[PDB]
């Protein structure tokens, strides 16, 4: 009968592809509630570090202060979120921000004209100086401890090329952003993943065999490599059902819609987790499962109140 | 509102985790109830969904000129074939999973790319409440207008309705 | 206003991919589809983000009142 050890016997993982920014891995023999739990947590509850309080001192640009502040919030920072604890709210602003809970990023850009390009618009970058304000212009400003702690992990935007604002001569932007630790559920800027999604393994149950040119003609109805034919005189086989996209295009043809069934494997889950750069996607998954476990420990430890 | 005069208020800002996610790994921007279409017959919106989806995947704009198409050259066939060449359901559906539970929904869900427009009438902001305020000197009754912190009118018909209910102590 | 930082639907940062995308449509004489394929916008939520963008800020910026004209 069911035990957690019979699950451990039955649970499988297969990792297809592990990139430092994307992980495509499978969870075989699990419950949908658990895969969805990991997905949901990877999205909303896994903490990440993002700009939260932007303090402007001047903004003469044609871009609205609020809007630019939101855009600076959206910039993902390449920061290991474990270098910082949460900032409370029960306490005054003077205690809220310390070098243990806050990261300071300064932005001071002044747009000028350049001494005379060639023709005219010869773009913007040659006619003007610092015409393009990028996330790469967010200078990291450490304090004390974290100054040393980041000696070998300085704060950088995970994509410096993000255009943040465009200026014109005499326009200027001076602001100081306070980046804090937050979760993707409280606001989408704190979600560390771009897309964490699962898809059930497509299953293509061939009810009766097809062969010859009808077998290859069936083969071309699916993504190139899902259905394989080795000889076709005896069978039209499935090279890999994982390549399919469930376009259900085969059902358009009576040649097949009565000799094939299209289902899924309820136990087999194909996870795809792509990271925004703040953290490696597998490490994000590790934090998600350790988060669910930590939540179960919190519920064990709590006293049932009445 | 869509470009189809099918306007609706946002009932809630659904969490992304709770939205439905496709096997493509996305969760929609907007969810519109299907039962709105059967009375309105806004099928141009269905075609705009399947055309914006085809045109985003192949990465080109689609021509929507009235009568560029024909009963013998339907848009469902044109964008159906273009989309199916792209790698998507010929009918334009996509297999979606429940955000909340996680099972695959009964059927392939109709997803697409639609030009949506924000009406200036955020009547949400037009809310007003008055439990106290100025009164006109000629009546001592609540003044008029939201910006005057005025009070909504209990008109003649609402009086009639309160007499209907027998609620004479509510009418007083 | 300006190329969005992220794709509303998915979440992938896209604001870095505008200028190269525009360069890829000019310099490489590419087509919008192939340019977006080389940019990694392999989802239509991302595809549409950059494909449909209208960088109206260039029109706004010529109204800069802080320099003589």
């Amino acid at each position: 009968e069911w035990n957690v050890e019979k699950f451990k016997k039955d649970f499988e993982v297969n990792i297809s592809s592990l990139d430092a920014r994307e992980a495509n891995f499978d969870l075989i023999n699990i419950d949908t509630s658990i895969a969805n739990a990991f997905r949901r947590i990877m999205i909303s509850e896994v903490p990440s570090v993002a700009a939260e309080y932007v303090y402007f001192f001047n903004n003469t640009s044609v871009i609205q202060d609020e809007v630019l502040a939101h855009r600076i919030g959206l910039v993902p920072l390449k920061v290991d979120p474990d270098m910082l604890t949460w900032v409370d709210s029960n306490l005054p602003d003077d205690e809220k921000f310390t070098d243990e809970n806050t990261i300071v990023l300064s932005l001071n850009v002044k747009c000028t004209r350049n001494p005379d390009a060639p023709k005219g618009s010869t773009d913007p970058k040659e006619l003007y100086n610092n015409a393009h304000v990028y996330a790469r212009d967010l200078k990291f400003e450490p304090q004390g401890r974290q100054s040393t702690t980041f000696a070998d992990c300085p704060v950088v935007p995970a994509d410096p090329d993000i255009l943040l604002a465009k200026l014109r001569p005499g326009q200027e932007i001076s602001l100081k952003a306070h980046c804090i630790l937050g979760i993707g559920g409280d606001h989408a800027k704190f979600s560390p993943v771009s897309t964490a999604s699962y898809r059930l393994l497509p299953q293509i149950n061939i009810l009766q065999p097809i062969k010859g040119e009808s077998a290859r003609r069936f083969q071309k109805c699916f993504p190139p490599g899902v259905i394989g034919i080795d000889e076709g005189s005896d069978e039209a086989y499935v090279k890999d059902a994982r390549k399919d996209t469930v376009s259900r295009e085969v059902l358009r043809y009576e040649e097949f819609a009565d000799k094939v069934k299209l289902g899924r494997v309820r136990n087999h889950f194909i996870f795809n987790v792509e990271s925004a750069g703040a953290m490696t996607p597998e490490e994000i998954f590790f934090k998600s499962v350790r988060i669910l476990k930590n939540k179960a420990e919190y519920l064990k430890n709590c006293p049932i109140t009445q | 509102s869509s470009r189809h005069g099918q306007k609706g208020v946002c009932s809630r800002k659904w969490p992304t985790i709770d939205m439905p996610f496709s096997e493509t790994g996305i969760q929609p921007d907007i969810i519109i109830n299907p039962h709105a279409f059967p009375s309105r017959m806004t099928i141009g919106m269905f075609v705009e969904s399947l055309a914006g989806k085809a045109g985003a995947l192949h990465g080109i704009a689609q021509d929507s000129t009235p009568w560029i198409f024909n009963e013998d050259d339907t848009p469902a066939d044109y964008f159906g074939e273009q989309l199916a060449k792209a790698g998507y359901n010929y009918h334009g559906n996509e297999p979606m999973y429940s955000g909340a539970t996680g099972e695959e929904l009964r059927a392939d869900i109709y997803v697409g790319v639609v030009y949506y427009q924000r009406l200036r009438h955020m009547v949400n902001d037009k809310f007003q409440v008055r439990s106290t305020g100025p009164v006109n000197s000629l009546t001592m009754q609540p003044v008029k207008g939201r910006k005057r912190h005025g009070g909504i009118r209990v008109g003649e018909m609402e009086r009639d309705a309160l007499i209907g209910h027998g609620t004479s102590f509510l009418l007083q | 206003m300006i190329v969005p930082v992220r794709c509303f639907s998915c979440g992938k940062v896209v604001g870095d991919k505008w200028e190269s995308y525009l360069n890829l449509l000019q310099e490489d004489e590419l087509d919008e589809g192939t340019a977006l394929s080389r940019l990694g916008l392999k989802r239509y939520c991302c595809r549409r983000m950059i494909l449909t963008h209208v960088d109206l800020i260039e029109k706004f910026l010529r109204y800069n009142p802080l320099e003589k004209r």
Binding site: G225, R242, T245 | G59, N70, Y78, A86, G87, Y88 | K42
Partner: peptide, 24 residues
């Protein structure tokens, strides 16, 4: 009447998650 022409670059733009045109 002429039928509106289908696009010439009508080719696969969608793959499974895990895959690419290296299998195309």
């Amino acid at each position: 009447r002429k039928d509106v022409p289908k696009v010439e670059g009508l080719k696969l733009e969608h793959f499974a998650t895990g895959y690419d045109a290296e299998d195309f």
